[PDB]
Amino acid sequence: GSSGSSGTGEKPYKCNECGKVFTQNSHLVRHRGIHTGEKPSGPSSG
Ligand SMILES: [Zn+2]
Numbered sequence: 001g002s003s004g005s006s007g008t009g010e011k012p013y014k015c016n017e018c019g020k021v022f023t024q025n026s027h028l029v030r031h032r033g034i035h036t037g038e039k040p041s042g043p044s045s046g
Pocket residue numbers: 015016017018019020031032035
């Protein structure tokens with residue numbers, strides 16, 4: 001049984017596929033390119 005205390009400072013723009021942030025939204029979108037049409041396996045809980 002572990003506790004939270006996991007995660008320090010999280011940007012308002014993060015990826016759900018792998019888990020990455022960006023200084024801007026535009027950038028984030030570009031990244032998704034690696035996921036788009038690339039073994040897209042969405043999570044179960046959200
Ligand atoms: Zn990603």
